[PDB]
């Protein structure tokens, strides 16, 4: 693993909010998978409409 700070490349004075991650997903990460599903989970009794 090679990791280095990117203050020169990926840092903006106004605030970089471009990186987002996901909450809900049913299946586990199978080896060598790329899934772009947009399913929203019904994790309770009130449906998410």
């Amino acid at each position, epitope marked *: 693993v090679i990791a280095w700070n990117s203050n020169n490349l990926d840092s903006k004075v106004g605030g970089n909010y471009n990186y987002r991650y996901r*909450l*809900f*997903r*049913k*299946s*586990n*990460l199978k080896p060598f998978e790329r899934d772009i599903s947009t399913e929203i989970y019904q*994790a*309770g*009794s009130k449906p998410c409409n």
Partner: antibody
Amino acid sequence: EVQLLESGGGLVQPGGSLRLSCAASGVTVTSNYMSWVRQAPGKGLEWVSVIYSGGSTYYADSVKGRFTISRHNSKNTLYLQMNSLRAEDTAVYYCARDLREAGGMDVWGQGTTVTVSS
Amino acid sequence: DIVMTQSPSSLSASVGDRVTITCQASQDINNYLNWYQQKPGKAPKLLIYDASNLETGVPSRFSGSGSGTDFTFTISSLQPEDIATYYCQQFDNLPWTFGQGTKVEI
């Protein structure tokens, strides 16, 4: 429909086995976040353990090897058998459906206390 | 690890006085602190999340603010229902240790 009920707790002695359990309905413990947390008397909340999606177990510092966690989707239940306990473990424990970082512990139940007095 | 050294733990005041709660942290919390209402003996109830947004149900007499090292909680209209212990929590650096909370009793 959705509900997280608590079972277990009592007056087990230090080093004595006990079983705490959180039975869920409406969610899936195996493929979603869930957690157990303690609250000591006279002290603030203390994180205990989490179960993630993908078979990855993470615990706190003091419960790294003293608790045993196992999950089942047959009734959507999480079980923690605790052995080799300590006297300080007397505290009010909660099972929570923590949903990452959008406000911690937004939803609360009742919670059950565990006294480890001799 | 992020640990908060909050100076006040139990402050007593008369009826109608303002409530100002300051929670200092060792490291910078990035818009990621919460304010709860826990009440004497009752379970904590979350009011302020993500340091800027209000939850539906929270009374207008409660306010929370902060983005960085400094975090503030303000109550202008003092009520007997506000006798409680307000906690500051940082869900920012793993492990997410909880705060001690300052106890206001009138």
